C-alpha cells in the first residue's frame with residue numbers, strides 16, 4: 371500500500387531537525403510524535419517532506435494561486451499536512467482539516483514591563499512597529515478583518531509590508547529582540563517562546579479562537595480517519611502528555 | 624427545496640421555550656440564534672423538532688442501539704442536530720460533526736466552601752455521591768476511561784446508577800442543591816449555572832478538552848457547508864457576541 375506523502379514545516383517545538391540521519395529519522399517534535407502515533411493507530415507508512423517554499427499558505431490577490439502547505443494539498447502533491455496548520459474559513463473552502471488536535475488564538479509577543487497592554491494600544495500608535503508571518507493565517511486574519519482595530523492594524527502592516535511582515539516565526543521573534551517591534555503570532559508558540567526567553571511576554575488576551583488540524587486534499591478519506599484517531603488520543607489523555615513533553619522550559623519570574 | 628429537519632434538546636441557555644407561539648417561533652437561545660444565522664448564510668428553511676426521548680445519545684451495551692439526537696441522525700430522521708452536542712470519538716464513528724462552535728471540558732459542579740478540590744478527592748470517598756447525565760457524553764467518557772481516577776469514579780456511578788445518573792442537567796443541578804452530591808457536567812453549562820446561583824461552583828479544572836459541533840448524518844454535504852459558516856462567524860467575532868448574549872447573570876461574590 372502506498373506510503374503517504376506528509377508535508378510539514380520547520381517550527382519549534384512542533385517540527386525540528388534532530389541535533390546529532392536520513393529519511394523520517396531526521397525529524398523530531400510534537401507534530402512528528404503526533405504523526406507517528408497516527409501511523410500506528412491507522413496503519414500507514416509515510417514520507418516526511420518539508421514544504422519547498424517554507425510557507426504555511428495564503429492565496430495571492432492578483433492571480434488566485436495558493437502557496438505553502440495549503441498549495442501542496444490543493445495540488446494533491448501531499449496526502450497530509452501534519453504541522454501547526456491553523457483551521458480557517460478561507461482554507462476550509464479549498465482543503466479539508468481533521469478535527470483540531472490543539473487550540474490556539476492569535477495574540478501579541480513583545481518585551482516585558484511596557485505600557486502596551488492590547489492590540490488597541492498598538493493600533494493607535496506607530497513608533498512600535500508590528501507585523502506577522504507573511505502568507506500565514508495570522509496575516510490573512512488581519513487582511514480580511516472588518517473589526518475596526520484589526521482593519522487599522524492591517525492598513526499599517528500592508529503599508530510597511532517589506533519591513534514588518536517576516537518570513538518565519540523565528541524571524542519575528544528575533545525582530546522583537548532587536549528592534550522596537552511587537553509580533554502578532556499564535557498563543558501556543560508564544561507559550562513556548564516565553565517559557566524559554568524571559569525577556570518576552572504575551573500582551574493582552576487571545577484575539578480569536580481556533581485550532582490546528584491535520585490538512586488533507588479536499589475529499590480525502592483520511593480526514594475522517596485522522597479525526598477519529600485524534601479524538602481518541604485526546605480522550606485517553608495522550609495529546610495532553612504530548613504537549614507537556616514539548617512545552618518545557620526553565621520558566622521565568 | 625426541502626426544509627431541513629433540525630433535532631435539538633431543551634437546555635438553558637442553548638435552547639429554551641420562549642416565555643409568553645407556534646413552529647420555530649416557540650424557541651430561543653444560543654443554539655437557536657446559531658441555527659437562524661446558519662439558515663440565512665447558507666440559504667435553507669428548517670423545522671425544529673425536540674428529540675422525542677429527551678436524550679443526547681449513547682450506544683446500548685446489550686443490543687448496540689443508539690438513542691437521543693445521535694440516533695435521530697444515524698437513522699437520517701433529522702438533517703442537523705443544532706444543540707450542545709459534544710464531539711466525541713465514539714460519535715464521530717457513526718455520525719459527522721461540523722468544526723466546533725464552542726469549546727468545553729468536563730468538570731465538577733458542587734457547593735462552595737468545601738474541602739473538595741478535584742475529581743481525585745471525590746474518587747477516594749463515598750459520602751459525597753456523584754454522577755452525570757444518563758446517556759450523554761460525560762457518562763460515556765467515564766464509562767470508557769482507562770485513567771485510574773475516572774475508572775474508579777465510573778465503578779462508583781455504575782454501582783449506584785439508579786440513584787446517581789440523572790435524566791437532565793437540570794436534575795443534576797437540583798440534586799447538588801438538595802443532597803450531598805457533586806455533578807459531573809460540562810464547563811460551559813457550569814459557567815452559566817454559577818453566574819446565576821451563587822451557592823454553586825466549579826471544582827477543579829477541566830478533565831478533558833473538546834467542543835460542541837453541529838451533528839449531521841454521516842456523509843451529509845451540509846457538514847462542510849456548516850463548518851465554513853461557523854468558521855466565518857467565529858472569525859468575524861459573531862460567535863463571541865452570541866455567547867455574551869446568553870451567558871448573562873447577576874454574578875456572585
Ligand SMILES: O=S1(=O)NCN(C2CC2)c2ccc(F)cc21
Nearest residue numbers: 457470473580581722723724725
Ligand atoms: O477553528 S475551529 O475548528 N472552529 C472555531 N473554534 C471556536 C470555538 C468557536 C475552535 C475552537 C478550538 C479549536 F481547537 C478549533 C476551533
Ligand SMILES: O=S1(=O)NCN(C2CC2)c2ccc(F)cc21
Nearest residue numbers: 469470471472710723726833834
Ligand atoms: O473535540 S475536538 O474537535 N478535538 C479535540 N480538541 C482538543 C484540542 C485537542 C478540541 C478542542 C476544542 C474544540 F472546540 C474541539 C476539539
Ligand SMILES: N[C@@H](CCC(=O)O)C(=O)O
Nearest residue numbers: 426454455456506507508
Ligand atoms: N500556524 C500559522 C502560521 C503562523 C501564523 O500565521 O502566526 C498558519 O497555519 O498559517
Ligand SMILES: N[C@@H](CCC(=O)O)C(=O)O
Nearest residue numbers: 679707708709759760761
Ligand atoms: N452535551 C452532552 C450532554 C451533557 C453531558 O454529558 O454532560 C452531550 O452531548 O452528550
Ligand SMILES: [Cl-]
Nearest residue numbers: 418419420421
Ligand atoms: Cl524534506
Ligand SMILES: [Cl-]
Nearest residue numbers: 671672673674
Ligand atoms: Cl418539537
Ligand SMILES: [Cl-]
Nearest residue numbers: 468469721722
Ligand atoms: Cl471536521
Ligand code: NA
Nearest residue numbers: 462463465466
Ligand atoms: Na474543506
Ligand code: NA
Nearest residue numbers: 715716718719
Ligand atoms: Na464521522
